[PDB]
Each structure stands twice: as C-alpha cells, then as structure tokens.
Amino acid sequence: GCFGYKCDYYKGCCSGYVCSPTWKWCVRP
C-alpha cells in the first residue's frame, strides 16, 4: 500500500487506502 501518502481530491490513495479527512494522508478504513 501507501500509508502516509499525502492525499487530496486529485491525489487519491492506493487501493487498500482512503484519504483521512482529519490528517490528509492515506489510512486503512
């Protein structure tokens, strides 16, 4: 995966992962 990947609307996370609305990085749900 991609834990920590800094993400936003056009910078989506890897599959497995979702963009934390608190921290704006990729986490597992």
Short mmCIF file of all heavy atoms in Angstrom, two decimals, unseen atoms left out:
data_model
loop_
_atom_site.label_atom_id
_atom_site.label_comp_id
_atom_site.label_asym_id
_atom_site.label_seq_id
_atom_site.Cartn_x
_atom_site.Cartn_y
_atom_site.Cartn_z
N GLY A 1 0.79 -1.27 0.00
CA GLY A 1 0.00 0.00 0.00
C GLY A 1 0.81 1.30 0.00
O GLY A 1 1.77 1.42 -0.72
N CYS A 2 0.36 2.28 0.80
CA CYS A 2 0.69 3.71 0.69
C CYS A 2 0.36 4.52 1.94
O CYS A 2 0.00 5.65 1.84
CB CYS A 2 -0.07 4.35 -0.47
SG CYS A 2 -1.88 4.29 -0.45
N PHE A 3 0.48 3.91 3.10
CA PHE A 3 0.16 4.55 4.38
C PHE A 3 1.04 5.88 4.52
O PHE A 3 2.27 5.85 4.33
CB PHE A 3 0.41 3.54 5.52
CG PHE A 3 0.46 4.13 6.88
CD1 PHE A 3 -0.66 4.44 7.54
CD2 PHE A 3 1.62 4.44 7.45
CE1 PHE A 3 -0.62 5.13 8.75
CE2 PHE A 3 1.68 5.12 8.64
CZ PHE A 3 0.56 5.47 9.27
N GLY A 4 0.39 7.02 4.77
CA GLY A 4 1.08 8.24 4.96
C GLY A 4 1.10 9.09 3.71
O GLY A 4 1.34 10.26 3.80
N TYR A 5 0.80 8.48 2.54
CA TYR A 5 0.87 9.17 1.26
C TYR A 5 0.01 10.41 1.48
O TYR A 5 -1.10 10.31 1.96
CB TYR A 5 0.36 8.27 0.05
CG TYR A 5 0.23 9.00 -1.38
CD1 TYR A 5 1.36 9.35 -2.12
CD2 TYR A 5 -1.03 9.34 -1.93
CE1 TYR A 5 1.26 10.01 -3.32
CE2 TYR A 5 -1.12 9.98 -3.14
CZ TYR A 5 0.03 10.32 -3.83
OH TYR A 5 -0.07 10.93 -5.07
N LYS A 6 0.57 11.58 1.22
CA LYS A 6 -0.23 12.76 1.32
C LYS A 6 -1.23 12.81 0.12
O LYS A 6 -0.85 12.64 -1.05
CB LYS A 6 0.66 14.03 1.50
N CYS A 7 -2.50 12.98 0.46
CA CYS A 7 -3.59 12.86 -0.41
C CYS A 7 -4.51 14.09 -0.32
O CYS A 7 -4.63 14.80 0.72
CB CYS A 7 -4.37 11.58 -0.08
SG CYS A 7 -5.02 11.44 1.61
N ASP A 8 -5.22 14.30 -1.43
CA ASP A 8 -6.35 15.27 -1.56
C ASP A 8 -7.32 14.85 -2.70
O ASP A 8 -7.32 13.70 -3.12
CB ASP A 8 -5.84 16.71 -1.75
CG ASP A 8 -4.85 16.85 -2.90
OD1 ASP A 8 -5.16 16.44 -4.04
OD2 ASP A 8 -3.83 17.50 -2.68
N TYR A 9 -8.15 15.76 -3.15
CA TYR A 9 -9.15 15.45 -4.12
C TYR A 9 -8.61 14.83 -5.42
O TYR A 9 -9.21 13.91 -5.92
CB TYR A 9 -9.95 16.70 -4.42
CG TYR A 9 -11.12 16.47 -5.35
CD1 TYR A 9 -12.32 15.95 -4.88
CD2 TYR A 9 -11.04 16.77 -6.68
CE1 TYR A 9 -13.40 15.78 -5.71
CE2 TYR A 9 -12.13 16.59 -7.52
CZ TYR A 9 -13.30 16.08 -7.00
OH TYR A 9 -14.34 15.88 -7.81
N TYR A 10 -7.49 15.35 -5.96
CA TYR A 10 -6.86 14.80 -7.16
C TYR A 10 -5.71 13.89 -6.87
O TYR A 10 -5.24 13.19 -7.79
CB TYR A 10 -6.39 15.91 -8.13
CG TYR A 10 -7.50 16.77 -8.72
CD1 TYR A 10 -7.59 18.15 -8.43
CD2 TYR A 10 -8.43 16.24 -9.59
CE1 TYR A 10 -8.58 18.94 -8.94
CE2 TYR A 10 -9.41 17.05 -10.14
CZ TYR A 10 -9.48 18.41 -9.80
OH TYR A 10 -10.49 19.26 -10.31
N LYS A 11 -5.22 13.89 -5.63
CA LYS A 11 -4.26 12.90 -5.19
C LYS A 11 -4.90 11.78 -4.33
O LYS A 11 -4.93 11.81 -3.09
CB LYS A 11 -3.16 13.56 -4.45
CG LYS A 11 -2.19 14.30 -5.31
CD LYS A 11 -1.25 15.20 -4.46
CE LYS A 11 0.19 14.63 -4.30
NZ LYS A 11 0.41 13.53 -3.29
N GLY A 12 -5.53 10.86 -5.02
CA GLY A 12 -6.14 9.76 -4.40
C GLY A 12 -5.12 8.81 -3.85
O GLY A 12 -3.96 8.81 -4.20
N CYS A 13 -5.59 7.98 -2.96
CA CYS A 13 -4.77 6.96 -2.27
C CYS A 13 -4.70 5.70 -3.13
O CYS A 13 -5.50 5.50 -4.08
CB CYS A 13 -5.44 6.67 -0.88
SG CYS A 13 -5.34 8.03 0.33
N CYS A 14 -3.77 4.85 -2.81
CA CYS A 14 -3.78 3.49 -3.36
C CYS A 14 -5.01 2.69 -2.92
O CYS A 14 -5.68 3.02 -1.95
CB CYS A 14 -2.49 2.75 -3.03
SG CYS A 14 -2.22 2.47 -1.30
N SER A 15 -5.38 1.73 -3.74
CA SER A 15 -6.38 0.75 -3.31
C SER A 15 -5.88 -0.01 -2.07
O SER A 15 -4.70 -0.27 -1.92
CB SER A 15 -6.71 -0.24 -4.44
OG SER A 15 -8.09 -0.43 -4.48
N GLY A 16 -6.80 -0.26 -1.17
CA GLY A 16 -6.48 -0.62 0.18
C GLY A 16 -6.74 0.59 1.12
O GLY A 16 -7.08 0.40 2.27
N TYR A 17 -6.61 1.83 0.59
CA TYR A 17 -6.43 3.02 1.39
C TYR A 17 -7.37 4.15 1.02
O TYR A 17 -7.83 4.24 -0.12
CB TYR A 17 -4.98 3.48 1.33
CG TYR A 17 -4.04 2.63 2.13
CD1 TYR A 17 -3.68 1.37 1.70
CD2 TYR A 17 -3.49 3.10 3.30
CE1 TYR A 17 -2.83 0.59 2.42
CE2 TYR A 17 -2.66 2.27 4.09
CZ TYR A 17 -2.32 1.02 3.63
OH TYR A 17 -1.45 0.20 4.32
N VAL A 18 -7.61 5.00 1.99
CA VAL A 18 -8.55 6.10 1.90
C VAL A 18 -7.98 7.37 2.49
O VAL A 18 -7.19 7.32 3.39
CB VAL A 18 -9.90 5.79 2.64
CG1 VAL A 18 -10.73 4.78 1.82
CG2 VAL A 18 -9.72 5.25 4.06
N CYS A 19 -8.47 8.52 2.04
CA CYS A 19 -7.89 9.78 2.39
C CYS A 19 -8.53 10.30 3.67
O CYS A 19 -9.72 10.66 3.69
CB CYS A 19 -7.94 10.79 1.27
SG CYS A 19 -6.85 12.22 1.61
N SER A 20 -7.75 10.25 4.76
CA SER A 20 -8.21 10.76 6.08
C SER A 20 -8.55 12.21 5.95
O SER A 20 -7.73 12.99 5.48
CB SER A 20 -7.19 10.55 7.17
OG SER A 20 -7.52 11.33 8.33
N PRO A 21 -9.83 12.56 6.29
CA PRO A 21 -10.29 13.92 6.31
C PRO A 21 -9.76 14.76 7.49
O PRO A 21 -9.89 15.94 7.47
CB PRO A 21 -11.82 13.76 6.40
CG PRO A 21 -12.06 12.44 6.99
CD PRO A 21 -10.89 11.61 6.76
N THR A 22 -9.15 14.14 8.49
CA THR A 22 -8.53 14.88 9.57
C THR A 22 -7.05 15.20 9.24
O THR A 22 -6.61 16.35 9.43
CB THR A 22 -8.69 14.12 10.93
OG1 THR A 22 -8.49 12.72 10.74
CG2 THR A 22 -10.02 14.23 11.39
N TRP A 23 -6.32 14.22 8.69
CA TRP A 23 -4.88 14.32 8.52
C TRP A 23 -4.43 14.45 7.11
O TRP A 23 -3.29 14.75 6.91
CB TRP A 23 -4.20 13.13 9.13
CG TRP A 23 -4.52 12.99 10.48
CD1 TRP A 23 -5.33 12.02 11.07
CD2 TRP A 23 -4.12 13.86 11.53
NE1 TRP A 23 -5.41 12.24 12.41
CE2 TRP A 23 -4.69 13.37 12.72
CE3 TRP A 23 -3.33 15.01 11.58
CZ2 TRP A 23 -4.45 13.98 13.95
CZ3 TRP A 23 -3.08 15.58 12.78
CH2 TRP A 23 -3.66 15.09 13.94
N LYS A 24 -5.32 14.29 6.14
CA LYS A 24 -4.98 14.40 4.70
C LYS A 24 -3.84 13.52 4.30
O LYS A 24 -2.97 13.92 3.51
CB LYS A 24 -4.61 15.81 4.28
CG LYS A 24 -5.27 16.92 5.02
CD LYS A 24 -6.77 16.87 4.96
CE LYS A 24 -7.34 17.82 5.99
NZ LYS A 24 -7.87 19.08 5.43
N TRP A 25 -3.84 12.34 4.83
CA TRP A 25 -2.99 11.30 4.35
C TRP A 25 -3.79 9.98 4.33
O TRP A 25 -4.81 9.79 4.99
CB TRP A 25 -1.69 11.18 5.18
CG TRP A 25 -1.90 10.87 6.75
CD1 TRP A 25 -2.54 9.79 7.29
CD2 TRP A 25 -1.39 11.63 7.87
NE1 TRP A 25 -2.53 9.88 8.64
CE2 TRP A 25 -1.78 10.96 9.03
CE3 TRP A 25 -0.57 12.77 7.98
CZ2 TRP A 25 -1.45 11.43 10.34
CZ3 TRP A 25 -0.24 13.22 9.24
CH2 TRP A 25 -0.69 12.56 10.41
N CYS A 26 -3.22 9.05 3.61
CA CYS A 26 -3.79 7.74 3.42
C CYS A 26 -3.66 6.81 4.62
O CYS A 26 -2.56 6.57 5.15
CB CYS A 26 -3.14 7.10 2.19
SG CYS A 26 -3.38 8.02 0.67
N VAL A 27 -4.81 6.24 4.96
CA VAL A 27 -5.01 5.26 6.05
C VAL A 27 -5.82 4.10 5.53
O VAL A 27 -6.54 4.26 4.63
CB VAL A 27 -5.73 5.94 7.26
CG1 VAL A 27 -4.89 7.10 7.76
CG2 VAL A 27 -7.12 6.45 6.95
N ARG A 28 -5.70 2.97 6.13
CA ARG A 28 -6.74 1.94 6.02
C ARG A 28 -8.07 2.23 6.79
O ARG A 28 -8.04 2.52 8.00
CB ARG A 28 -6.22 0.59 6.50
CG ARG A 28 -5.08 -0.01 5.74
CD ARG A 28 -4.73 -1.32 6.39
NE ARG A 28 -3.45 -1.86 5.95
CZ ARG A 28 -3.10 -3.17 5.99
NH1 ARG A 28 -3.93 -4.11 6.45
NH2 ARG A 28 -1.89 -3.54 5.50
N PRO A 29 -9.24 1.98 6.14
CA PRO A 29 -10.58 2.03 6.76
C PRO A 29 -11.05 0.76 7.49
O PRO A 29 -10.22 0.06 8.06
CB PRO A 29 -11.47 2.31 5.59
CG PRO A 29 -10.74 1.70 4.43
CD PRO A 29 -9.32 1.57 4.73
#
